[PDB]
Ligand SMILES: C[C@@H]1O[C@@H](O[C@@H]2[C@@H](O[C@H]3O[C@H](CO)[C@H](O)[C@H](O)[C@H]3O)[C@@H](O)[C@@H](CO)O[C@@H]2O)[C@@H](O)[C@H](O)[C@@H]1O
């Protein structure tokens with residue numbers, strides 16, 4: 001009606017980024033998810049550009065941490081007292097679950113902890129792991145703990161950054177038992193309930209399943225479950241945030257098109273609250289052409305019947 | 310008449326990503342560039358969406374490598390035989406300087422080298438550094454070397470990834486002497502000329518300088534020069550690539566606007582070949598409101614005289 005036309009990006013899946021970890025998308029996946037709660041906090045955005053949960057705009061400020069560190073005596077463990085992106089003091093009273101970009105799964109995330117000494121520009125970097133299921137993982141309260149490879153190299157009161165790389169598993173344990181991508185951390189610790197969460201999502205329509213945007217997280221030790229599914233590519237979050245096109249119905253019908261044939265491969269529902277469903281029953285890795293893309297076709301209701309995927 | 314209208318993203322500087330390394334933008338910087346050649350290969354795209362140099366679309370597939378590795382006896386060094394993003398064979402004959410996303414500066418980039426064994430899903434990760442100025446750095450040929458913290462953990466003929474984190478310097482030598490952000494690597498090795506390059510850029514009007522989109526790379530050891538300037542944010546590259554709006558003239562005039570006050574702070578030229586200039590003389594860190602953004606106003610040409618910044 002003159003309303004700003006809704007669109008999705010024309011970037012292909014492999015040209016886009018996982019919204020839950022700073023790695024490329026690899027593929028589309030669908031499977032049943034009735035048995036458990038799907039309530040990721042990263043990669044959550046309405047089609048009209050309202051960021052939800054812990055979602056922020058940067059594809060490379062996901063699962064990062066910044067602040068000051070203090071050594072835990074008799075250990076190679078450091079407590080990081082969190083700062084903001086701009087390196088200011090952290091504010092815990094904001095009505096968010098945790099700082100934006102905080103990890104939204106229970107797992108042992110490995111990367112590098114790096115630091116610069118302001119006075120002379122000296123620098124240092126150490127392999128480090130943050131276990132988001134641990135008692136000291138209290139990002140909402142302004143603190144997390146890292147296990148590192150040093151007992152003395154990090155300085156106090158100097159800007160320190162964690163850059164995530166991948167995940168680990170304890171190899172004396174049954175394989176692929178962690179990370180648990182669908183388990184939220186307890187952002188304030190084990191005795192305090194999470195707050196201000198983006199809602200859980202599920203298909204409601206018979207024969208429908210969620211369509212996931214899937215990556216494989218690098219594994220850094222042990223026998224981890226490396227699958228990582230997001231609801232929206234990070235580029236879609238950035239696109240909707242900018243466009244802010246109002247939803248004209250509950251569902252934006254998308255067609256996934258193959259340029260090499262000119263034909264539609266499948267269609268799907270992009271729910272205005274920011275998730276996708278397809279008509280399929282079972283676990284399936286979608287096979288798509290490298291140049292295939294999503295195209296918005298029309299606003300439909302929640303109860304539209306999709307052609308089977 | 311009838312050209313698709315040109316636009317730039319409304320994302321703020323701080324909401325965008327460096328196109329030369331997987332870190333957020335921090336600030337805008339201008340300075341004289343007569344003392345160097347500004348010929349980065351990442352973050353190069355025309356306003357009409359033609360990717361140049363080694364530029365690709367993923368903000369998280371910049372300064373990464375994938376392939377499989379071979380140990381060099383007597384050392385902690387491994388040679389990686391490069392694969393593509395989707396783990397396929399690398400083609401050295403494609404008319405590009407190097408694989409898309411290859412580092413475009415001489416420096417020592419530190420990160421983690423990770424691996425998965427296909428048969429059992431066992432994984433491993435080690436701190437690793439790639440010396441992009443060294444003789445073994447031959448990405449165009451399909452081979453690069455990493456120095457690591459292990460002499461025996463990595464397996465042969467298993468998919469291996471390098472994830473970049475930051476840069477290092479040798480602390481026994483002159484501080485901030487490396488990395489050298491404006492020195493291109495020799496993509497095929499010592500004394501072999503590079504091919505298929507994106508061109509050097511410079512201001513071509515009196516009283517103009519390049520406008521750079523600047524970040525600070527993490528430092529991981531020693532006393533590195535952490536400054537990193539790109540010509541275009543990664544989001545701008547993604548935007549132009551998708552939009553493909555025809556360049557109506559040589560220069561798109563942009564205004565940088567403060568929505569808090571409603572006033573234009575400065576104007577600048579976005580050259581159709583994908584770089585920005587401003588009217589200023591001297592090194593200057595721009596001070597901008599966090600909410601400030603760029604807006605396309607009109608097509609002009611290279612003879613247009615800017616208002617002083
Ligand atoms: C499954 C196994 O995981 C990794 O080994 C770790 C051990 O890691 C430590 O030793 C290994 C070399 O043996 C390596 O140097 C690693 O960086 C270092 O932390 C250790 O954490 C044990 C303790 O539970 O778990 C695993 O065995 C990996 O390095 C191995 O190659 C292999 O994939």
Ligand SMILES: OC[C@H]1O[C@H](O)[C@H](O)[C@@H](O)[C@H]1O
Pocket residue numbers: 124479480530531
């Ligand atoms: O000369 C090498 C030396 O460089 C710095 O001093 C580092 O802190 C040390 O860990 C060591 O690597």
